[PDB]
Every structure is written in C-alpha cells, then in structure tokens.
Amino acid sequence: SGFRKMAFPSGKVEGCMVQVTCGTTTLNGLWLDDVVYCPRHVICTNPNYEDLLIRKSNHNFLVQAGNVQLRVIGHSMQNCVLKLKVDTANPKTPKYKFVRIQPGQTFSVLACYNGSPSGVYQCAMRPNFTIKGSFLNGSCGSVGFNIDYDCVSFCYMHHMELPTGVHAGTDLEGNFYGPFVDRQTAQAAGTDTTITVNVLAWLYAAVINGDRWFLNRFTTTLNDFNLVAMKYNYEPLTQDHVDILGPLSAQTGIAVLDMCASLKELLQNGMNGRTILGSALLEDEFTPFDVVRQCSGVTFQ
Amino acid sequence: SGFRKMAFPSGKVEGCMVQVTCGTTTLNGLWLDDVVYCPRHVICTNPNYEDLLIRKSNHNFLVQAGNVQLRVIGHSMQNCVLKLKVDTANPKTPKYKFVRIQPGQTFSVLACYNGSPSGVYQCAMRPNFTIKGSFLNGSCGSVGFNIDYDCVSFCYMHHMELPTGVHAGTDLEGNFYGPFVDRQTAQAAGTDTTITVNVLAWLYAAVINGDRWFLNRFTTTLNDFNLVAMKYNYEPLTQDHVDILGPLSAQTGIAVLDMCASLKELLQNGMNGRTILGSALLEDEFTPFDVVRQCSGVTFQ
Structure with a gap:
C-alpha cells in the first residue's frame, strides 16, 4: 500500500x-x-x-x-x-528502442550534468507537449524513458526551458514535441489542460488505497461528464479512455462512469479541506498503467 | 527551473x-x-x-x-x-556506508520484488519514525539510501506495513526506526507532525522558482512562530534549523524569520485556492539540502 x-x-x-x-x-x-x-x-x-x-x-x-x-x-x-x-x-x-510518446503518457527523467546523473523523477508529457520538469543549466541532453521488462524505451531528450519555466525537447530521432524549435524565438507553451483519464486513474488509486471519501451514489453519461469537464479545462474523456480504465473499474468495482460522477462533483465543489492520496489537488500525472503497476506488483530487469 | x-x-x-x-x-x-x-x-x-x-x-x-x-x-x-x-x-x-538518518531527513527508496528493482521514489523519515512509502507484498528488504559524490549511504531496510498503510523498517545494522518490532503485535504509528524546517525550505524553493505570492511584510520572533506552529501540529523550529536555512535565506534575500511569518499566515488563513510549486498543501518532504541540490546544480557519480 x-x-x-x-x-x-x-x-x-x-x-x-x-x-x-x-x-x-x-x-x-x-x-x-x-x-x-x-x-x-x-x-x-x-x-x-x-x-x-x-x-x-x-x-x-x-x-x-x-x-x-x-x-x-x-x-x-x-x-x-x-x-x-x-x-x-x-x-x-x-536492449533499447526509440519510441515517441503521446501527451498524457508518463516517463522517467534522468537529469544529468556533464554526463553525470544528478537525479531521477517521474513526469508526464503535458497536452501542450511541454513537460513540467526540473532542469538547471547543463541539463541539456538528459533523456526521458520507460522500462519494459529489460528494454529501455527512450522517448525524450531535453533541449530547452520555455519562458514559463516548463520544458521542451525531442524524441530520440530529433523531432520536437510540440511546435517548438531549437533557436531563440518568442516561443511559448500553449494553454495546457488536465489529463482527465489520468485523474480518474489516480482516483482509482486512492480507492485501492482506502481513500473512499470522494465517491458518490450518482452516475453520469460520458457526454454529460465531458460537458462539465470542458468547463474546467479537462481533456475530453473518450470511449478508449473508459476501456483502459476497465481493469481498475473491475478491481475496485466502481464503474468508470460512476467515478466520473465523483470527478464531476469534485470539480464542482472542490475538496473542502480533505485530501486524496496525500494531495489537495487532482493529480493528472499517473496513467492507468502506472496505477496498475504500483498496485499489482510488476517489476523490471 | x-x-x-x-x-x-x-x-x-x-x-x-x-x-x-x-x-x-x-x-x-x-x-x-x-x-x-x-x-x-x-x-x-x-x-x-x-x-x-x-x-x-x-x-x-x-x-x-x-x-x-x-x-x-x-x-x-x-x-x-x-x-x-x-x-x-x-x-x-x-563505495558505501551504513548510516542512520534522523526524522525529517530524506532518502531514496529502490522498491524491489524478488531482487528485481521495480521503481525509485523519494521520501522522508516521518517524525514518528515511519515512512509514507509505496510497497507491495515482497518489497521486504528493499533499501533506502542517499548518494554523496560516489558513496552510497544506506540508511533504511524495509520490513513491514503498519495498519495505517505507512511503513516501518531498520537501518542496515538491524536497529528499527521507531518503537516497532518484527513480530505480529498491535503496533501502530504514533501521531505524526509536520517537519517545519522542511516546509520552510520548500517555500524558499517556491520563491527561487518565481512563486512569490505567500510572502508578506510581517515578521515574527522564533518563540511567537513556535507558539502558532505547535497549534497546527508542526515540529518546533530551532536555532539550528534557522541556521541551516541561512544559505537559502541569502540566495533569496528573505530572512528566515520573515518566511516563518508567511508560514504563520499560511497556517492561519490557508491558501485560498492558490498553489505553491504545483501543490495545494505545504510540502514537508524536502530538506534544505534537497532544495539547494535541486537549485544550484550538484551531481553525483
């Protein structure tokens, strides 16, 4: 736990x-x-x-x-x-691969200076193709990655800090994430959104960990959710999202659309001083896979 | 940044x-x-x-x-x-050492199953000598550690989950952290407190990162702070704490006692929907060293 x-x-x-x-x-x-x-x-x-x-x-x-x-x-x-x-x-x-990740997917960063590894942290590719990283001068070239059994899937190389302090870089073939270039321009992050599918995966993680408050009797259709989601700057929830949350729905016996109704109320009422999984914010940087991995036992090597 | x-x-x-x-x-x-x-x-x-x-x-x-x-x-x-x-x-x-950490100190955990490393996360030794970790069956024996240039300072071995879901274990000489034993008893975590010196180090990290809201004109004596701190279940702030925050006070030019006055008001008024460093809670799991390390450039190898 x-x-x-x-x-x-x-x-x-x-x-x-x-x-x-x-x-x-x-x-x-x-x-x-x-x-x-x-x-x-x-x-x-x-x-x-x-x-x-x-x-x-x-x-x-x-x-x-x-x-x-x-x-x-x-x-x-x-x-x-x-x-x-x-x-x-x-x-x-x-054993490795070069793979390009989708916004909403997470990866680990090995922040490096002078080829010496400094630290490791987990982060997500924001929907606006930036990452909220932690980088200082000289971190250029630090890579992001996932591990699957023994294979390192390199997905990110770090290039630059954007004026808001978020970070931009490329995959390992050199193609940038987002509309950013490696020259000095006025480039800025576009407006970000919250990764709805991830917040729901995190709520399931809270339920799995005994945090059952936020739950409710209500339910909601996918359309009615997205109408409220959009209002709060949340990504749309797709049927594929709902299917990917399936296993977590099963393991906890809370239907996906029921959890959406809780999220709906959380967005409308806030948290009223309570917290979920040690957080007073809805966390959107855990995917459904991340939750399952950290709540089932899966290792790598 | x-x-x-x-x-x-x-x-x-x-x-x-x-x-x-x-x-x-x-x-x-x-x-x-x-x-x-x-x-x-x-x-x-x-x-x-x-x-x-x-x-x-x-x-x-x-x-x-x-x-x-x-x-x-x-x-x-x-x-x-x-x-x-x-x-x-x-x-x-x-190159390694066995060292025992103080509550309030942080370390990295390499969660392992069957000798295969699963994940790595940062955490702190709670003032009640538990850690809020992430462990599943078979994680027993996973170690916590810090790295200093090339030396691994092993400080923790994981033994058990306590009924509240927090974790207990020993140093590498086998002496438990806290009043816990490796047999089945009714043992529970004592009531925890918030690591005041760490919250202040985190606030400096926010200031270093442009988050200058929470700051204020006021100031406060150490005694008057601790009178309000104790009321909110915060560890006492000692003169040594104040000295360890010195370099961060210097780098930002906000005197330690001034930052305490901001913390005082944060505790008394809450955050009013704002956030600090992406968090709606005061974070107590970054030490003054952690902040400096992540805001100056220091590597290891």
Missing part, C-alpha cells in the same frame, strides 16, 4: 550517459552501441545547422565517458539531434 | 539487489562485498529468532543474483537483519 510518484530504476540509462563538448558548449549525450546522441545546438556558433555542421570536424567533439576519452570517427544530423559515431561500442548498452 | 520530488540515480544500488529465499519466504537482499543483508523474518517458522536461526544451515538460504546462484558459506544475526556470508564478492559493490 501507499502511492508515490515513482520513477523507473535508472541504472540501465546511467550506463549510457556521457559528456559531449565542442567549443565552449558542454552538454549530455546518450551513448548506445557506437553512436552518441546529443542535441544539435552543441554545434558551434539565428542558426542554420546544416551550414554550421559542414564547418566542423570529428576532432572538434570531445566525448567523455567517465575517465575515458571517446574518439569520434563520424558525425551526422538527424533533425534536432546530433549522431556522433564513436569508435567504441558502449559495453553497458541495454 | 522547476521543482520535482527527485530521487537519487539508483544504478549503484540496483547492482546490489539480490533475491533471498529460505523456506516458503522470498524477499530482497542487499549484496555488498561478500555479505548479503536481508531482514531476519526470512528465518523459518510469536518468534525467538536466536532459536530459529541455530535451527538452520547455510544450504537453506537460496540467494539469486540474477541468473547466478550464490553459495552461502556463513550466516549470523545483527539485530533485525540477517548477514549471509557468500563465497563471491559483489563485483558491482559501490
């Missing part, structure tokens, strides 16, 4: 974190097999990165894997990330 | 997590050098563990380090943990 913002064990990823330096720019790189991935704004000197990259040679890239120099024997650009071919395959290379 | 419940990178500890089986009991063990540490309630069959342990032989203990059997060549009891001498030193043994 208990419920915690849990992150995946980070060792498999720590073994891949390196330091990439070229010029006066130092950031973090991801070393898989004989490639080191890192953000392309490490390239020297309003940019045009194809120009700047042809301007460069391998020996410009200093790659530090712990105490060991790493010799760059080739480079290339893949959208907003640099692929730096090195002469050594990372012996600690886990 | 941003602020997250961050946990230490867990790889150094994952390399030490093993599986310990004897009888029909399976739990997690900690493999450092040629010792495997684990809770003693793994011993077979109202207990008297000295009796039960002399009843046993090495070959009763099945120790699984991944795919590799581990041969137990000796055992012994150290308070509530079992030390199982094995014939192989853990090649992945990090």
